[PDB]
Amino acid sequence: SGFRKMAFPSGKVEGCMVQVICGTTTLNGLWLDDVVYCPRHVICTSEDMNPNYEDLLIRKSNHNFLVQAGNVQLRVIGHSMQNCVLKLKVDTANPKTPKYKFVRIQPGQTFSVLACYNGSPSGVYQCAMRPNFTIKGSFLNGACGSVGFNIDYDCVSFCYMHHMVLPTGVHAGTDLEGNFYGPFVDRQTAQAAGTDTTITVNVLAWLYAAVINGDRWFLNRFTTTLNDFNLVAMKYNYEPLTQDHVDILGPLSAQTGIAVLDMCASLKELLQNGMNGRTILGSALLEDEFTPFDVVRQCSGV
Amino acid sequence: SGFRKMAFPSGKVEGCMVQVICGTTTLNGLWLDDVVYCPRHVICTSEDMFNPNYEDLLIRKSNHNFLVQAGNVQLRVIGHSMQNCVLKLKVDTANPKTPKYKFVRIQPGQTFSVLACYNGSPSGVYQCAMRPNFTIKGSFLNGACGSVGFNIDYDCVSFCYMHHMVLPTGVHAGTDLEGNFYGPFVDRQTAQAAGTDTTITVNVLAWLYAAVINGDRWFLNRFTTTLNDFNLVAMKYNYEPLTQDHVDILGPLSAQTGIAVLDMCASLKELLQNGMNGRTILGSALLEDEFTPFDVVRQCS
Ligand SMILES: *C(=N)[C@H](C[C@@H]1CCNC1=O)NC(=O)[C@@H]1[C@@H]2[C@H](CN1C(=O)[C@@H](NC(=O)C(F)(F)F)C(C)(C)C)C2(C)C
Ligand SMILES: *C(=N)[C@H](C[C@@H]1CCNC1=O)NC(=O)[C@@H]1[C@@H]2[C@H](CN1C(=O)[C@@H](NC(=O)C(F)(F)F)C(C)(C)C)C2(C)C
Ligand SMILES: [Br-]
Ligand SMILES: [Br-]
Ligand SMILES: [Br-]
DSSP: OOOOOOOOOHHHHTTTTEEETTTTTTEEEEEETEEEEEEGGGOOOOOOOOOHHHHHHOOGGGGEEEEETTTTOOOEEEEETTEEEEEESSSOOOOTTSSEEEOOOTOOOOOOOEEEETEEEEEEEEEEETTSSSSSOOOOTTTTOOEEEEEEEEEEEEEEEEEEEEETOEEEEEEESSSSSSSSSSSOOOOOOOOBBHHHHHHHHHHHHHHTTTTTTTTSSSSOOOHHHHHHHHHHTOOOOOOOHHHHHHHHHHHTTTTHHHHHHHHHHHHHHHHOOBBBTBBBSOOOOHHHHHHHHHHTTT | OOOOOOOOHHHHHHHTTEEEEEEEEEEEEEEEEOOOOOGGGGGGGGGGSOOOOOHHHHHOOGGGEEEEEETTTOEEEEEEEETEEEEEEEEEEOOOTTSEEOOOOOOOOOOOEEEEEEETTTEEEEEEEOTTTTTTTOOOOOOOOTOOEEEEEEEEEEEEEEEEEEEETOEEEEEEEEETBBOOOOSSOOOOOOOOBBBOOOOOOOOOHHHHHOOTTTTOOOOOHHHHHHHHHHHTTTOOOOOOOHHTTTTTHHHHTOOOOOHHHHHHHHHHHHHHHTTBTTTTTTOOOOOHHHHHHHHHO
């Protein structure tokens, strides 16, 4: 009953967040086993932009880094730069390290963000990797080091670490190996995201969520082909729908008795006519940050 | 940068969630120190749907009818009492991860984070508002009862909600942690209806301030108005009346934007009487009312 933008429980990640201080710069780190992962621009100041990280790191020693888990100080015994993240080796292993893995998500996938400041968790919310490799998050100054994650069984899959905000108000970051999502660099210079698109497979998953919860006015008796659908979808800046996407919506087709191409034809008419002052799941816009798997998980058993 | 529906970190509450089994019925409980709190209808079955005599059913139940499971460790019940619609199960083991907490009764218009759980395992977290009709617009499946809503005020977890039922319109109802329902609802399967809901005016205003802080300012005009004149219009659109308390609580956001509260009221009045001009505010084509002034301040610090 009901459908909400839902984040994963953040407990397993809260126990890994620490404060990383280097000189006057403070951000968050991720403490897993005896390593703290954090954005490399912690070694910079307003002075340090060409943010030539190589030089800045060379002049640093281990005592220049203060890692704080709450009030307990963790001693740094090593420091290394892997792409855009800094790996600080510490003498103490995190006793709350969950079973984890580092994954690189694809555009269209969703994840939970634990927004932190000064190593202290502030809030949790759900995001999606946009097609242009940005995310529409909520981050303030000092938020860098906050991570995005999924919980798969008992395993925390870390997929995002926050680095910067672009002039359009969207956010950009890396995986836990320091590799940015999208064509961005961790330097304050003129950078742009690129035209974003609507995640079509997710809109369809959300329309299936609407049917499961009673909203079914947008359903029509028409059907269509994938190519005919994609021809219309291109015009409205929608991502093209693939046969993989059709198969992943199968569970929702099974739960509703509505064929995917029948839902595609219902989506086609909504795009060309609008909602006529009506709402879908209490929204006057089409929502695209629910994957089919999110919908299946949330509507399980209805 | 950006504005999202943001829940509190749920870690402190995840460590209090347990499974309560009574016969064939399984739901969630809240384990604080040596007491487990759960909805009393865990002692019922489909048979008891007609005249559910909880007093009777509970006395007919003993301690061995309750199986409490914290992960794999079973907690033995050594006492049980019924406070209104919640059951207090005395257990032999105290939760070593019990946070500093208090039980509070929230007011309509206030928000809280919900930790949705099933079989004692936390599944997801999201933010909710206590609607003016004392329902909440949540997402719960079978077995979700016992899930709790909470706020974190400094170092204290303030528990304010325990989930009990879904109403025919798809909205949800529950009690505070003292067993007293929010709204005119009872914990039995009988004909119940929520009642006409209204829009939380002070929250819409706080959300308009959040949009201005984040760059959205097309709805800003040079107009202003009075409290009474605004309320005369808002009443027509099924908006809750704005009080001077609400005007004072929007003060922090007026300070952050330099926009007087009554000027933002005049912007909302125009939005109500003219529409949103096919435009969006913070990515919404409707006015949002589930962000309190505190939620915005905390997120936009
Ligand atoms: C991490 N602590 C912050 C997070 C930012 C601050 C405001 N909200 C956020 O999401 N990240 C930064 O300050 C990074 C950091 C230097 C500059 N920077 C930026 O986000 C800047 N933006 C850009 O350079 C742009 F637009 F190109 F993306 C800033 C102008 C400060 C907003 C580094 C190393 C990239
Ligand atoms: C707790 N585990 C469930 C949660 C429900 C199930 C589906 N989604 C939810 O939020 N609560 C219940 O099953 C409660 C429980 C008996 C009946 N009930 C209901 O929610 C029923 N609704 C009503 O009686 C109504 F409409 F009046 F609110 C039901 C018909 C099963 C949906 C008790 C003791 C209230
Ligand atoms: Br939502
Ligand atoms: Br404008
Ligand atoms: Br007046």
